[PDB]
Design a protein around this nucleic acid. Structure first.
Ligand SMILES: [Mg+2]
Ligand SMILES: [Mg+2]
Ligand SMILES: [Mg+2]
Ligand SMILES: [Mg+2]
Ligand SMILES: [Mg+2]
Ligand SMILES: [Mg+2]
Ligand SMILES: [Mg+2]
Ligand SMILES: [Mg+2]
Ligand SMILES: [Mg+2]
Ligand SMILES: [Mg+2]
Ligand SMILES: [Mg+2]
Ligand SMILES: [Mg+2]
Ligand SMILES: [Mg+2]
Ligand SMILES: [Mg+2]
Ligand SMILES: [Mg+2]
Lengths: 100, 152, 99, 127, 83, 114
RNA sequence: GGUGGGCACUCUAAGGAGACUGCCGGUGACAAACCGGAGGAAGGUGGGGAUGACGUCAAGUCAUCAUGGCCCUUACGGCCAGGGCUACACACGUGCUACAAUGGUCGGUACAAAGGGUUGCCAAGCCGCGAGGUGGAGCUAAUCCCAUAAAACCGAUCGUAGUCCGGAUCGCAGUCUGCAACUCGACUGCGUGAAGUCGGAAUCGCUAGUAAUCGUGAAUCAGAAUGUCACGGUGAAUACGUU
């Protein structure tokens, strides 16, 4: 949870959102059956031309407050040990301790 | 245990013979919650008994139990150097359950084709009193009487 | 014929909002069909409570989502649109259809 | 005419209608034997009739939802018992003695934190 | 295995370097870090120094290794024997 | 008959014994030429036993199958790829554990030193 | 229930009623209380959960965070490409699958609960043996999708064999996600078919919808569960007693 880690992952989603669209039609052309290899290879090399740090699958989300990789819940934006703090103080709306 | 708080649970659901002992035996032969498989096994065994000979299966089953339930049992107690095996008269409720358990246990290792046939064979043998279960019963009796000096 | 849907995280204020919208609905003189209690969503989480290794040390939380459905007949005076600011205030989400 | 009853057992719910007739017995628009195939379900569903010995007098219409076979049978028995009480409200004693009106409230215990089943635990090696 | 919708995968720089070096026949190993690459059928008879993890080991290409990958010819762990 | 085919058995099950035909292949053979797999091969006429011989002689059996499998193994052995190296030490070649539990490729337990 | 229609019911979710030793009998220091009985859906804190007193173990965490002192400041700070955390003579802990006939296959059919989905679910039809591919409907969802529950029941066969048991391992050919499946993904088809015949000393969980067995969902997550957390189906034996 260093400063460098958060900064570089932030740069990662910035770079991913930079193009965020050329990937779509490149992969569409690759995956299109009625596309022919003549232009499909060109789309392949165009896809591989972009910087490697641009795919969505390289994004590992972290806690919005601590930048912690493990223990994440996507309903909220926080980690395992800050969601409890937020909820037990009553900050998180709708969340209560449950028995059922 | 110490509390003596749990009373008995009564379920009496014989589907086609109207006997409580048959339902309890179906409980004994059951494994992993297969009620219906146990019913099929018991009914097949009784049908094999009915087909083999003119004897009706229910009376054969009942008098096979009456020829297998033990009369006295051995219970161990230590004294600091030796454990003596005192005899106690089995309660009228324990004997039925012990007989059923022994019957099904030695049926499971009879060795012939199917469980229904194994039960059939065990019932035929016990109605005359010559199986392994009656050997176990008489072994228990002779052990218990051999330790009659303790009895109290 | 209009359709009114209400959502909330708790039943106090959504019940209050339903009662006040329906009484305003009678006020204009329009027919109303009663409040329909829809099934309430219940979403649960289990979270470890120790900063380090204790797997059985867990705490369990849940969120409940309550829904209500109303409809009316023969409307003429629509101040509900004109009271939309007052009609929903804090934690009640209101949907209108076929206005 | 007719009588109504509702039954509930093991998350299985049943609506029962008693009418005059000759025991047609309909469950979800199909026959009893076509519904419960060769098990004790037929006897356990039939008992509240021979206990009050009016099996031939009543036609029974049944709708069921939820649960498994045994839960469905128990729910039907409970519903028929309640409807029969609603029909001839003097035989409460017989069905109480048989324990038929008593609704069994046993349910599936919830799974626990740190446990595998509701009560099973890991093996506890001490070293 | 890679889907046959796109059979061949090859790194662009390594591909262009190999297809440029074919003019002047095998004279020096081509050093590279792309173990993911698959041997092309048209580059046989040329030697590639693939990254191992600390240095580059040389591999000579024959016909019986076309469908394989470079990384299979540079072992990454040593295990010179327990005893 | 065949190559020591076992008799007194259903046709498909007996046909399974030929090292190169399993259960889907045996029933495919039984279906390509009309025979009843419910019928024991002990009771099949030679006029159809030779028909099954013709059907089985189409793909591979015994000697040629083992020969090609061993040829593949030796090719992997002598190429020098990771698969071959892992395959000559008698260790699992598909990425399974070796820290513990690789006993089918490593045979007996064979203790440690003294 | 496809339509008109009804507000009976079921169900859904809000407000309430009910069980408190209340009534009767007995025991009791005519005290607390104990043993029974009636009524009742529930009787004796009805069942399950949450809630953890003062303190203990200088118990765990400086690596979620925060923080005193000490330490590095052309390196103990940074960016990148590969590799490693996946190694393997061995020992241990926790689980899944079996060793079969209360079973394995082939065909016919019955019944759940809970939950996830608009950077998502992803149908009908068509193409493949299959993983899967085209297609684009509907759904901001008690409406559409995930999404046929399995064990059970009915009919045939296998007839006690290391086998129509068991599936490890290996060869060949593939699909999908992803810039990229060699190290090191998950599934599919064909072939192969290992140990394993109920386990020494020792040792574990469980008192009723429990143990045992059968399926289903979710979080994390592009892809990756025999783990974790939940949901239901079938459904026992035993407790004399306190040496
Ligand atoms: Mg910091
Ligand atoms: Mg990731
Ligand atoms: Mg009573
Ligand atoms: Mg529950
Ligand atoms: Mg141990
Ligand atoms: Mg009492
Ligand atoms: Mg009472
Ligand atoms: Mg606690
Ligand atoms: Mg210390
Ligand atoms: Mg320490
Ligand atoms: Mg790197
Ligand atoms: Mg690790
Ligand atoms: Mg098999
Ligand atoms: Mg207990
Ligand atoms: Mg269960």
């Amino acid at each position: 949870a260093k400063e460098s880690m958060k900064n570089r992952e932030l740069k990662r989603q910035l770079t991913v959102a930079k193009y965020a669209k050329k990937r779509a039609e490149l992969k569409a052309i690759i995956a299109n059956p009625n596309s022919s290899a003549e232009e499909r290879w060109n789309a392949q090399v165009a896809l591989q031309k972009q910087p490697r740090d641009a795919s969505a699958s390289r994004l590992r989300n972290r806690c919005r407050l601590t930048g912690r990789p493990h223990g994440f819940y996507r309903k909220f934006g926080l980690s395992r040990n800050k969601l409890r703090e937020a909820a037990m103080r009553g900050d998180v709306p709708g969340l209560v301790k449950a028995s059922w | 245990p110490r509390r003596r708080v749990a009373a008995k649970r009564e379920v009496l659901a014989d589907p086609k013979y109207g006997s409580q002992i048959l339902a309890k035996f179906m409980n004994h032969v059951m494994e992993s919650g297969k009620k219906a498989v146990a019913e099929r096994i018991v009914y097949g065994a009784l049908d094999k008994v009915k087909e083999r000979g003119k004897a009706d299966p229910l009376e054969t089953f009942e008098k096979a139990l009456d020829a297998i339930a033990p009369l006295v049992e051995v219970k161990s107690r230590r004294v600091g150097g030796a454990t003596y095996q005192v005899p106690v008269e089995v309660r009228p409720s324990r004997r039925n359950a012990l007989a059923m358990r022994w019957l099904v246990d030695f049926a499971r290792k009879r060795g012939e084709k199917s469980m229904a046939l194994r039960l059939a064979g065990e019932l035929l043998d016990a109605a005359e009193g010559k199986g392994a279960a009656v050997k176990k019963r008489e072994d228990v009796h002779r052990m218990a009487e051999a330790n009659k000096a303790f009895s109290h | 014929q209009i359709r009114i849907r209400l959502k909330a995280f708790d039943h106090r204020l959504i019940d209050q909002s339903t009662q006040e919208i329906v009484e305003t609905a009678k006020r204009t003189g329009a027919q109303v069909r009663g409040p329909i209690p829809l099934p309430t969503r219940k979403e649960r989480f289990t979270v470890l409570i120790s900063p380090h290794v204790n797997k059985d040390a867990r705490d369990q939380y849940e969120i409940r989502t309550h829904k209500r459905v109303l409809d009316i007949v023969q409307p003429t005076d629509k101040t509900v649109d004109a009271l939309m600011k007052l009609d929903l205030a804090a934690g009640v989400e209101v949907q209108i259809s076929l206005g | 005419t007719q009588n109504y009853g509702t039954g509930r057992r093991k998350t299985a719910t049943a609506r029962v209608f008693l009418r005059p007739g000759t025991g047609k017995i309909s469950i979800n628009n199909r026959g009893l034997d076509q519904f419960f195939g060769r098990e004790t379900a037929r006897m356990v569903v039939r008992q509240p009739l021979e206990l009050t010995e009016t099996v031939e007098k009543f036609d029974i219409f049944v709708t069921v939802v939820g649960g498994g076979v045994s839960g469905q049978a128990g729910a039907i028995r409970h519903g028929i018992t309640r409807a029969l009480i609603e029909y001839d409200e003097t035989l409460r004693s017989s069905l109480r003695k048989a324990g038929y009106v008593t609704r069994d409230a046993r349910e599936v215990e919830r799974k626990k934190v740190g446990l595998r089943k509701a009560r099973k635990r890991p093996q506890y090696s001490k070293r | 295995p890679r889907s046959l919708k796109k059979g061949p995968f090859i790194d662009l720089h390594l591909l262009k370097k190999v297809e440029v070096a074919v003019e002047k026949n095998d004279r020096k190993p081509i050093k590279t870090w792309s173990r993911r690459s698959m041997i092309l059928p048209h580059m046989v008879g040329l030697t590639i120094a693939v990254h191992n993890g600390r240095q580059h080991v040389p591999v000579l290409v024959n016909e019986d290794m076309v469908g394989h990958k470079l990384g299979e010819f540079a072992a990454t762990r040593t295990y010179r024997g327990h005893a | 008959a065949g190559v020591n085919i076992p008799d007194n058995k259903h046709t498909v099950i007996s046909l399974t014994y030929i090292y190169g035909v399993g259960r889907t292949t045996a029933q495919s053979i039984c279906a390509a030429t009309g025979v009843n797999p419910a019928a024991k091969i002990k009771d099949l006429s030679d006029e159809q036993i030779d028909q099954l011989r013709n059907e089985v002689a189409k793909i591979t059996t015994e000697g040629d199958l083992r020969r090609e499998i061993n040829m593949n193994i030796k090719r992997l052995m002598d190429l020098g790829c990771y698969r071959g190296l892992r395959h000559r030490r008698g260790l699992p070649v598909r990425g399974q554990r070796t820290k513990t539990n690789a006993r089918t490729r490593k045979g007996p337990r064979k203790p440690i030193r003294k």
